[PDB]
Design a protein around this ligand. Structure first.
Ligand SMILES: [Zn+2]
Ligand SMILES: [Zn+2]
Ligand SMILES: [Zn+2]
Ligand SMILES: [Zn+2]
Length: 359
C-alpha cells in the first residue's frame, strides 16, 4: 500500500522500452489483489493503425510450451502415458531407436540427451520428421543434460495427444482450451478472429505473421491475447473444476531437475521467490537457453509450491512475449509485443513491475 497508481508504474517501465526497441504495440496484463488490470500500448497493425487491446491476438511463441505441457500432463492423468514411460512405448515407429532409452518426462523437460533447439531444415514434412527422430544419436546419457529444444517438447506434445487417440490440435481446441475457459486462444486463427490478429514486425522492420514449421503447434504456435493468457495464469493460481485438469496444472508446477537457480517443470520454469533481477536474467540467458548444461538431478520429481516465481519466454520472427507469476502473492505479469525484442529487456521490465506489485 501507499504506492503510486498502477498505471503510472506500468507506463513508466513499459513506455520507455517501447521507444527504445521501436515496439509497435504491446498488451500488458497484471494480476494483483485478486483482480486483473490491463494496460494497452500502440498498434497491432502499423498500416491500419488498429489499436492493441487485451483482445488483440499475438503470436506467443514458446509461451505455447506451457499449454502443450498442460495438455501432456492432462493426457498422463487421463491414463494415456506415464511420465516415467519410455518414449517408444507411445510411438511404434520409434521402437528400436534411441527413444527406447528416453522417458516422456525427459522429452518434456529437454533432457533426452542433446536434441537441438530447432529441427534441421530438411525436416519439412511428417515423413521427414519421423526419419529425423529414428536417426537421432544421443550426445549425452538420458536425463543428464538439459538442452532447450523444439524437437523435444514438440514430440512430447504430439505423442501425448495421440496417447488419447486424438491429434494435438483437436485435443487442445476441443478439450483443453474450453476446460480452461480460453475462448480467444488458437492454433489456427479462425476467420471470425482474423480482424484481431496483430502483425509482427521483423528485425528489418517488415510485417510478418505466420508460425510455419514441423510441430509448430506444439512448440511455438499459439495465438492469444493478454486477457486469455492472464486467465490461464489465473488457473495456475487456483483452478477448480475438472479434477484431471487440476492435477495436470499441479504437474506443470512439479520440478524435474534444476540448472543453477532455475528449476525445470513441465513448460514452466521457476525460481525461489523472491528472485533477484540478476538470477532471473541468468536463467533466461543463452548460457541456459542455447547450449547444453548438466542438470542437478532430482531423486524424485517434486512439487515446487507457491513461494516461487514461475515464468516462460516466447518469441517468433515478429513477436516477443513473456509471462511470470507468483502464486503465494497473487501477482502476475503478461507482456505481449509485436516485435521480437531482447529477452533481457522483457525480464528487466517484468521484474521491476512484479517488485512493485508485491509491495
Ligand atoms: Zn486496475
Ligand atoms: Zn471456446
Ligand atoms: Zn469474442
Ligand atoms: Zn556435460
Amino acid at each position: 500500500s501507499g504506492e503510486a497508481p498502477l498505471t503510472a508504474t506500468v507506463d513508466g517501465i513499459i513506455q520507455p522500452m517501447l521507444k527504445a526497441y521501436r515496439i509497435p504495440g504491446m498488451a500488458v496484463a497484471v494480476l494483483k489483489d485478486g483482480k486483473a488490470h490491463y494496460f494497452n500500448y500502440g498498434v497491432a497493425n502499423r498500416e491500419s493503425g488498429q489499436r492493441v487491446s487485451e483482445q488483440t491476438l499475438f503470436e506467443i511463441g514458446s509461451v505455447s510450451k506451457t499449454l502443450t505441457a498442460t495438455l501432456g500432463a492432462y493426457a498422463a492423468v487421463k491414463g494415456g502415458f506415464e511420465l516415467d514411460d519410455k518414449v517408444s512405448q507411445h510411438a511404434p515407429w520409434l521402437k528400436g531407436s534411441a527413444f527406447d532409452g528416453v522417458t516422456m518426462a525427459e522429452l518434456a523437460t529437454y533432457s533426452a540427451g542433446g536434441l537441438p533447439l530447432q529441427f534441421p531444415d530438411e525436416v519439412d514434412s511428417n515423413d521427414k520428421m519421423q526419419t529425423y527422430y529414428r536417426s537421432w544419436s544421443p550426445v549425452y546419457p538420458a536425463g543428464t543434460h538439459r538442452q532447450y529444444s523444439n524437437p523435444s517438447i514438440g514430440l512430447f506434445g504430439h505423442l501425448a495427444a495421440n496417447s488419447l487417440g486424438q491429434p494435438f490440435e483437436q485435443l487442445m481446441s476441443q478439450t483443453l482450451l474450453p476446460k480452461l475457459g480460453l475462448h480467444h486462444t488458437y492454433i489456427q486463427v479462425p476467420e471470425s478472429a482474423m480482424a484481431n490478429y496483430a502483425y509482427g514486425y521483423s528485425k528489418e522492420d517488415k510485417p510478418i505473421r505466420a508460425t510455419p514449421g514441423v510441430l509448430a503447434a506444439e512448440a511455438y504456435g499459439i495465438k492469444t491475447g493478454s486477457a486469455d493468457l492472464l486467465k490461464f495464469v489465473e488457473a495456475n493460481m487456483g483452478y477448480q473444476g475438472d479434477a484431471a485438469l487440476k492435477s495436470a496444472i499441479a504437474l506443470t508446477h512439479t520440478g524435474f531437475h534444476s540448472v543453477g537457480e532455475m528449476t525445470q517443470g513441465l513448460g514452466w520454469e521457476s525460481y525461489d521467490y523472491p528472485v533477484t533481477e540478476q538470477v532471473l536474467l541468468a536463467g533466461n540467458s543463452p548460457a541456459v537457453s542455447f547450449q547444453a548444461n548438466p542438470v542437478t538431478r532430482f531423486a524424485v520429481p517434486k512439487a515446487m509450491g507457491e513461494q516461487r516465481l514461475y515464468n516462460k519466454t516466447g518469441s517468433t520472427g515478429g513477436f516477443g512475449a513473456y509471462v511470470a507469476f507468483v502464486p503465494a502473492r497473487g501477482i502476475a505479469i503478461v507482456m505481449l509485443a509485436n516485435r521480437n525484442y531482447p529477452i533481457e529487456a522483457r525480464v528487466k521490465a517484468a521484474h521491476a513491475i512484479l517488485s512493485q506489485l508485491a509491495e
